[PDB]
Write a protein that binds this ligand. Sequence first.
Ligand SMILES: [Zn+2]
Length: 252
Amino acid sequence: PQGPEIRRAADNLEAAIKGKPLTDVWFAFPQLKTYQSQLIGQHVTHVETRGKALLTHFSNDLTLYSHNQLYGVWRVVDTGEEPQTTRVLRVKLQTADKTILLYSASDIEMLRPEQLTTHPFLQRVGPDVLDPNLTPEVVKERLLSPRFRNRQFAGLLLDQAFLAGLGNYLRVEILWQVGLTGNHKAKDLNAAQLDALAHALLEIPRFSYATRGLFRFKVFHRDGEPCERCGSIIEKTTLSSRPFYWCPGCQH
DNA sequence: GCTTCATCCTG
DNA sequence: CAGGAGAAGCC
Ligand SMILES: [Zn+2]
């Protein structure tokens, strides 16, 4: 899962317990046990995202950080209820009625103010595609800036240092959107393809966020399926040490 | 890249 | 049941 799916969950989280006094806190990691009693009686002032990184802030200026990587997922149940699964619960934040549960995730750390600009991941990430103030123009400048100008999209479109919230499926989809493969570079592009790439880089991820579960897959998990644009045979290969879906007669 | 820690589902 | 599907670590 990526930014789109991470913001949708964050919101579900805010919709369930934000502003609500926590009647209980629980963590799997012993190291975090110390913040439990500490958090009881406090409340989430706001849950923030910055890519696939999840920051759940508290009234006492503490912030719960977490990355779902590829297995962590958030649940939202009614207090006292715990649907079953083999997943390993990692965090419990409960209030009178609503409760949220985090399973699987392994990157769960508690930050005080300072680490919010010091954490290993937080320090690294670039603008958020879901971030409003982030405009195509800015994103367009960044593509041409000297820090990314000479980098292939196959790898760049995955690098959080460039843009937070983009993952693989968004990787294949965005490039298919503008008819490109992962072997190009911002510098090897005309003004019409950069501006295109630019928007797709923000619009698509958003469209996914706003509509995924309208948004549908156009090349992800579609090997053997017919390209909807030209109709060529979409092949599955490996790009960036991960699966890459694309159209042979649609991407150059 | 490449190699590795780290969960969970098909397959 | 081995593979396989977001990042940091080391050349
Ligand atoms: Zn095509």
